Design a protein around this nucleic acid. Structure first.
Ligand SMILES: Nc1ncnc2c1ncn2[C@@H]1O[C@H](COP(=O)(O)OP(=O)(O)NP(=O)(O)O)[C@@H](O)[C@H]1O
Ligand SMILES: [Mg+2]
Ligand SMILES: [Zn+2]
Ligand SMILES: [Zn+2]
Lengths: 250, 102, 628, 54
DNA sequence: TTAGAGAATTGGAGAGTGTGTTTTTTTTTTTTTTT
DNA sequence: ACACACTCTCCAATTCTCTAA
C-alpha cells in the first residue's frame, strides 16, 4: 500500500529545492540560493541544510508549508527522499561519507517560524507538529551513541540479517533467515556494519520574567542530535525548534 | 560596516571617558564615584603570571555600605540587568551549597 | 412495535429524554424562572419573554465557541422537564451525553432551517458540551457515603496544588509490517482493541499489524488537590482533602490558594496488588470527575457606580463601610481603604519598575481592636492570607525546597493583601526576610539544585504592641515602636493608637458594645447609611481595572514643596515616593484620570495624622498625652 | 466528545422482550452504529480459498 | 445437471511443560546538652 | 502453588475431486 500525499509532497519539495528562484540581493537576476547552498556543502563536506519558513510560506499558495507544518512526523521521510535525488543530480560527491563508503545521513533544518511558544503552552493537541520554544538551560547530559540501524548474525549457522529498525527500544530479528536453521537466540550486534548517531539530553525551565501571578516555573526535557550536540551551556538562554513527541514506558 | 563606523566615531571623541562614566545607571541621581568604580570593574585589569608560576589577580572586587533609602541596591539591579555574565543573590535566602556547587 | 433504547438497569427511554430536552432548549423563556422565584412583580415583560437558549446558541455560533452553561433549576421551571432534573442527578453519564448530542443537532438545525451562510462542515466538525451547575445543596467532604457512587455532587473548598498536564490517549494507530496497510482504532474503557489479523484481503496474516505511538491522538488530563474548608472540620481535628480529575477546556484554570466550588460525578475504581497480574484489592479508590468549576458588567452597574461616585460624602461613606460594626477609628479605616485601591504600577524601557502597593503598620495599646480590623481586611480582599508571628518561619513565609520548589504565604498572596498579627513576637531572623520582598516585590533564591527569582506584588498589613506591652510616654516614639530603622523605613503609613481614658468616649463605646446584646442575632449596625459588601467590592474592583491616574504639573510643584517642608528641620527619600503613591490611590477612589493639588494635600495630611506628629515634641520626640 | 472512561452503559430490548447490552456514548444515540457494533464483537470468520507463478 | 462417495488440507482444542513471585549529602522543624 | 507464556499433538471440520444416474 502506498501514500499518494507523501509522493506528491516529495516531488513538490523537489521542485522547491530546484527552482525557488529568488532574485539577487543587489540586482534583478535569479540566484537559486538552495542549489548554491548544496554546492557550499559540497565544498566543505557538511551534512545539514537550513531552510527559511518564509520562503516556504510563499510557495504554491502555502499548501506545501501547511502539510509540512501540521504533519511533520508523517512527511519527514518523504522530504529526505526528495532532497537525496537533488543532491545526486547536482553534487553526487555528497552522497557518500579505500574500501566502500557508507551513505551520508542528511539533516533538514528550519528557522524563522511565525511564533515562539512557552514551555507552559505545550499541550497534547499539538503532538507531532512543527514548533519553536525558548527558555533557560539548567542541565545537560554527556554525548552518547544511539543505535540508528542494526545488523545481526546467527550463532547456530552462518547467516546475516541487515537494516533492522529500532524506534524507542533495543530490537532484534524475529527469525533465522536461512531455512536450514530455526534458532532465534544468541544474536550478536555487528558494531562495524551497524550505524549510530550522536545523542544528548538537555533540560530547560521557563524564563523568570514570564511567570504568571503566584505561580512557579515549569520544566521540560529536550533531545539534541547530530551536529548540534554540546552547543548548549548551563545557565544560558536559548531558542529551540523541532517537533514535540511522546515517549513510552519502555 | 556601519557598526565599525559608529564605533570608530565614538572612539575618536575627546570627551569619551566622561560620557562613559555619565552613561552608567541613568536613573540614579549623582554618585558619580560609584558609577566610575562600576565601569572600571566592568572593564577589568590584565591577568598575568610570573616565572615562578604564581598567578597575579587581574580583576576588581567592590563593596557598597549605606544607611537606608540610599538606593544602593539600584546599582546591583543595573549591573545584573546589563552585564552579559552575571547573577543576583540575597545573603539571607541562600546556602553555601547553592553559592558554590552541590 | 419497534426495538427501544434503555439506560442499563432503569427502564428509562432515551427518546423521552431527548424530546423533552429539545423542547426545553428551543422554547424556554426566562419568565418561567421568575414564576418559581418569589414574585411575578419582578418580571421585565420586554426582556424576560425572550427565548434565552436560542439567543445563547446564536451567540455560540457567531463567537465561535463550544460550551454552554446550564443552571439546573430551569429544568424544574418548565413542566416537561420536572422529572428530567431527578434523572440527571441519578444517571449523569448517560443524560449528559444525551444533552450534548441534542445541542449539536439544534445548532445544525438553526443554520439549515434559517438557511444561513455558515459552513455546515465546520459545525459538523466541532464538539459541543453542556456544563450543568447549581445542582442543589453542597455536601460535606467527610459525609460522602458508598450510596453516592456515580451520582452528581457539589463541593466547596480551597486549592492546594495542581500536577502538570498528562497526555491521555483517545485513538490508536496501526500499520501492517509487511504490506503497509493502516487502521485507526477507537479507545473505550481504557482497552486498545487490537486486530487479530491484517484486514487487507490479499494480506490476511496473523500478528501482522503494529502500533505507531506518535501518530495516535491524545487529550489533556490534570489532577487538582482540593482541601476541606475550616467551616466543616470536626471538633479537635485537622482538615482533609480530596482529588479532582479535570479534562480539556478546564485544565489550567486554577492556581494554589484559589477558593472554588465544583460540580462532578463521585467515582470509585479498583487498584491492583502488583503490576504483574490481574489481582485487585478489596478497598476501592475514590475521586471526583468535575464537569464545572465556579469561583466563590451591565449598564445598570455602571450607572450605579457613576452615580455613587458623584456623592459629596463619598470618602467618609466608603471608609466607614469597610468595617461597619467597629466604632470610630476613622483615620485607620481611611488608610486601609487607600491600601485597597493601591497606586499605579509603572514599568520603563530602562530604569526598572516601581511598586503600586502600600504597606501599613498598626501599633499601640492592647484591647484597641487592631486584630478585629485585620479580620475585615482578610475577608474583603479577593486574594490574601492571615497569619501570626509565632506561627511563621522564614521558609513558610516565602518558599520551600521539597527536587521541586513550593510556595509560601507571600507568594500565595500575590496581588492581594497579607495580614500579619503579633508582628512583635517573630524574631529578627524571620523579620529580615521581609526587607527584599517589601522593597523590590521579588524573592531571590539560591540553594542546592535551585536558583531563581519570583514575583511578589504583595501588600502587607501589620499589627504589633510596643516594648513593655503598653505605650510608655517617658520614652520617644521610635524607642517605643522598637523596630530597627531599615525595616521601619519600608512602611508607607505607621499608626499610633492609644487607650486614653475619657468619660465622653467611654459612654459612647459602652452603649455601642452593650447594644449588640439586646437581640439574639443582631440587626443593629453602627451607622444609618453604609454600602453592601457586594457593591463595595464591585466599585473597588472596577476602579482598579479601568482607572490609571497621571501626575499633573501642579501636583508636581506641591509634592516638591511638601517634601522640602518635611525635610528642612527625619524625612527620608521614601517619604516622597509614598506620598506620590498615596495621592495616586486617592485619585482612583474618585474615578479621576489625573492627580491634583487636593489629592496631594490629602496624602500629606494623612501621613501627619497617623504618627501623632502635631502632639509630638519636635526636639525631644516624646508625645504630650494631654494633647491626644 | 467526552473521554474514553466517562462512558455509560446501554441496553436494547427486542420484540419478545429480550435484552442486549452495548457500551460507549455514541451507541446511546445511533442505533445503526449500535447494531453494527453489536455484531462486530463476535469472534469467528469463515476461512477462505485462493493462480499464477513462474 | 445433481448428488454422493472418497481423499487431502487445515484449526484450534486442549493438554502439557516450564517459569517467577516473598523481602553523602541537602533542606527544615524541634528537642536536648554543651559552652 | 498460583497465574501466565509458550509448545506440542490429535482429531474432525472443511473443500476438492471423481463417478454414475
Ligand atoms: N472601637 C471598638 N469597636 C469595636 N469593638 C471594640 C472597640 N474597641 C475595643 N473593642 C473590642 O475589644 C476587643 C479588642 O480585641 P482585639 O481586636 O484583639 O484588640 P487588639 O488591638 O488586637 N488588642 P491586643 O490583641 O491585646 O493587642 C474586641 O472584643 C473588640 O470587639
Ligand atoms: Mg488582638
Ligand atoms: Zn541460524
Ligand atoms: Zn498486511
Amino acid at each position: 500500500v502506498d501514500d499518494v500525499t507523501g509522493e506528491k509532497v516529495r516531488e513538490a519539495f523537489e521542485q522547491f529545492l530546484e527552482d525557488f528562484s529568488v532574485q539577487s540581493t543587489d540586482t534583478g537576476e535569479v540566484e537559486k540560493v538552495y542549489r548554491a547552498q548544496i554546492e557550499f556543502m559540497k565544498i566543505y563536506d557538511l551534512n545539514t541544510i537550513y531552510i527559511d519558513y518564509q520562503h516556504l510560506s510563499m510557495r504554491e499558495n502555502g499548501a506545501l508549508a501547511m502539510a509540512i507544518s501540521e504533519q511533520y512526523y508523517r512527511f519527514l521521510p518523504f522530504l529526505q527522499k526528495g532532497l537525496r535525488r537533488v543532491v545526486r543530480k547536482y553534487a553526487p560527491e555528497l552522497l557518500n561519507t579505500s574500501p566502500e563508503q557508507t551513505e551520508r545521513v542528511f539533516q533538514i533544518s528550519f528557522f524563522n517560524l511565525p511564533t515562539v511558544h512557552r514551555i507552559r503552552d505545550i499541550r497534547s493537541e499539538k503532538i507531532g507538529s512543527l514548533l519553536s520554544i525558548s527558555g533557560t538551560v539548567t542541565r545537560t547530559s554527556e554525548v552518547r551513541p544511539e543505535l540508528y540501524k542494526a545488523s545481526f548474525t546467527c550463532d547456530m549457522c552462518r547467516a546475516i540479517v541487515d537494516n533492522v529498525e529500532q524506534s524507542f527500544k533495543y530490537t532484534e530479528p524475529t527469525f533465522c533467515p536461512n531455512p536450514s536453521c530455526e534458532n532465534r537466540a544468541f544474536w550478536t550486534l555487528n558494531v562495524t556494519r551497524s550505524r549510530f548517531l550522536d545523542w544528548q539530553k538537555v533540560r530547560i525551565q521557563e524564563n523568570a520574567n514570564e511567570i504568571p501571578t503566584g505561580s512557579m516555573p515549569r520544566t521540560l526535557d529536550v533531545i539534541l542530535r547530530g551536529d548540534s550536540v554540546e552547543r548548549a551551556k548551563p545557565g544560558d538562554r536559548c531558542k529551540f525548534t523541532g517537533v514535540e513527541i511522546v515517549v513510552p514506558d519502555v | 560596516s556601519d557598526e565599525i563606523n559608529e564605533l570608530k566615531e565614538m572612539v575618536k571623541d575627546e570627551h569619551i571617558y566622561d560620557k562613559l562614566v555619565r552613561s552608567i545607571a541613568p536613573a540614579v541621581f549623582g554618585h558619580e564615584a560609584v558609577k566610575k568604580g562600576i565601569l572600571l570593574q566592568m572593564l577589568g585589569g590584565v591577568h598575568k603570571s610570573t616565572v615562578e608560576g604564581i598567578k597575579l589577580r587581574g580583576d576588581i572586587n567592590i563593596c557598597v555600605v549605606g544607611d537606608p533609602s540610599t538606593s544602593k541596591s539600584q546599582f546591583l539591579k543595573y549591573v545584573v540587568g546589563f552585564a552579559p555574565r552575571s547573577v543576583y543573590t540575597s545573603g539571607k535566602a541562600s546556602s553555601a551549597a547553592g553559592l558554590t556547587a552541590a | 412495535s419497534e426495538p427501544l433504547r434503555i439506560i442499563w438497569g432503569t427502564n428509562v427511554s432515551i427518546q423521552e429524554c431527548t424530546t423533552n430536552f429539545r423542547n426545553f432548549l428551543m422554547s424556554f423563556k426566562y419568565k418561567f424562572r421568575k414564576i418559581l422565584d418569589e414574585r411575578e412583580e419582578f418580571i421585565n415583560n420586554t426582556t424576560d419573554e425572550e427565548l434565552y437558549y436560542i439567543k445563547q446558541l446564536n451567540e455560540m455560533r457567531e463567537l465561535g465557541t463550544s460550551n454552554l452553561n446550564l443552571d439546573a433549576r430551569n429544568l424544574l421551571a418548565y413542566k416537561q422537564t420536572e422529572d428530567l432534573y431527578h434523572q440527571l442527578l441519578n444517571y449523569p453519564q448517560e443524560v449528559i451525553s444525551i444533552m450534548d448530542q441534542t445541542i449539536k443537532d439544534c445548532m445544525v438545525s438553526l443554520i439549515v432551517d434559517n438557511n444561513l451562510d455558515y459552513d455546515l462542515d465546520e459545525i459538523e466538525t466541532k464538539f459541543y458540551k453542556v456544563r450543568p451547575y447549581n445542582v442543589g445543596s453542597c455536601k460535606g467532604m467527610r459525609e460522602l457515603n458508598p450510596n453516592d457512587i456515580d451520582k452528581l455532587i457539589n463541593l466547596k473548598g480551597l486549592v492546594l496544588r495542581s500536577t502538570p498536564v498528562i497526555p491521555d490517549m483517545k485513538v490508536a494507530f496501526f500499520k501492517c509490517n509487511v504490506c503497509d496497510h493502516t487502521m485507526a482504532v477507537e479507545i473505550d474503557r481504557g482497552v486498545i482493541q487490537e486486530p487479530a489479523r491484517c484486514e487487507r484481503i490479499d494480506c490476511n496474516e496473523p500478528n501482522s499489524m503494529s502500533l505507531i505511538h506518535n501518530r495516535c491522538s491524545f487529550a489533556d488530563k490534570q489532577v487538582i488537590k482540593l482541601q476541606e474548608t475550616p467551616d466543616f472540620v470536626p471538633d479537635g481535628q485537622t482538615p482533609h482533602s480530596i482529588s479532582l480529575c479535570v479534562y480539556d477546556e478546564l485544565v489550567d484554570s486554577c492556581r494554589a490558594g484559589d477558593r472554588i466550588e465544583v460540580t462532578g460525578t463521585f467515582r470509585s475504581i479498583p487498584i491492583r496488588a502488583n503490576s504483574r497480574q490481574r489481582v485487585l484489592k478489596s478497598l476501592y479508590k475514590t475521586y471526583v470527575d468535575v464537569v464545572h468549576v465556579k469561583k466563590v458588567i451591565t449598564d445598570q452597574d455602571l450607572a450605579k457606580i457613576r452615580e455613587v461616585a458623584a456623592r459629596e460624602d463619598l470618602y467618609s461613606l466608603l471608609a466607614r463601610s469597610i468595617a461597619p460594626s467597629i466604632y470610630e477609628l476613622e483615620d485607620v479605616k481611611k488608610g486601609i481603604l487607600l491600601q485597597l485601591f493601591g497606586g499605579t504600577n509603572k514599568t520603563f524601557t530602562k530604569g526598572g519598575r516601581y511598586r503600586g502597593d502600600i504597606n501599613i503598620l498598626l501599633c499601640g495599646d492592647p484591647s484597641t481592636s487592631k486584630s478585629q480590623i485585620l479580620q475585615y481586611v482578610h475577608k474583603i480582599t479577593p486574594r490574601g492570607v492571615y497569619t501570626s508571628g509565632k506561627g511563621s518561619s522564614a521558609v513558610g513565609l516565602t518558599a520551600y525546597i521539597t527536587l521541586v520548589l513550593e510556595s509560601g504565604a507571600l507568594v500565595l498572596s500575590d496581588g492581594g493583601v497579607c495580614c500579619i498579627d503579633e508582628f512583635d513576637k517573630m524574631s529578627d531572623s524571620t523579620r529580615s526576610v521581609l526587607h527584599e520582598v517589601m522593597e523590590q516585590q521579588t524573592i531571590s533564591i539560591a540553594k542546592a539544585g535551585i536558583i531563581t527569582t519570583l514575583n511578589a506584588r504583595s501588600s502587607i498589613l501589620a499589627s504589633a504592641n510596643p516594648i513593655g506591652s503598653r505605650y510608655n510616654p517617658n520614652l520617644p516614639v521610635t524607642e517605643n515602636i522598637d523596630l530597627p530603622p531599615p525595616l521601619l523605613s519600608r512602611f508607607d503609613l505607621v499608626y499610633l493608637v492609644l487607650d486614653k481614658v475619657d468619660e465622653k468616649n467611654d459612654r459612647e463605646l459602652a452603649k455601642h458594645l452593650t447594644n449588640l446584646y439586646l437581640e439574639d442575632k443582631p440587626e443593629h449596625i453602627s451607622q444609618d447609611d453604609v454600602l453592601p459588601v457586594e457593591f463595595l467590592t464591585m466599585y473597588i474592583s472596577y476602579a482598579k481595572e479601568h482607572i490609571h491616574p497621571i501626575i499633573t504639573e501642579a501636583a508636581k510643584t506641591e509634592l516638591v514643596r511638601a517634601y522640602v517642608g518635611m525635610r528642612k528641620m527625619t524625612a527620608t527619600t521614601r517619604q516622597l515616593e509614598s506620598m506620590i503613591r498615596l495621592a495616586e490611590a486617592h485619585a482612583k477612589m474618585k474615578l479621576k484620570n489625573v492627580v491634583e493639588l487636593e489629592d496631594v494635600q490629602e496624602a500629606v495630611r494623612l501621613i501627619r495624622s497617623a504618627i501623632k506628629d502635631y502632639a509630638t515634641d519636635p526636639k525631644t520626640g516624646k508625645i504630650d498625652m494631654n494633647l491626644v | 466528545a467526552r473521554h474514553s472512561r466517562f462512558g455509560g452503559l446501554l441496553s436494547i430490548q427486542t420484540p419478545d422482550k429480550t435484552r442486549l447490552t452495548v457500551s460507549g456514548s455514541q451507541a446511546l444515540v445511533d442505533e445503526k452504529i449500535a447494531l453494527q457494533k453489536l455484531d462486530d464483537s463476535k469472534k469467528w470468520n469463515k476461512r477462505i480459498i485462493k493462480a499464477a507463478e513462474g
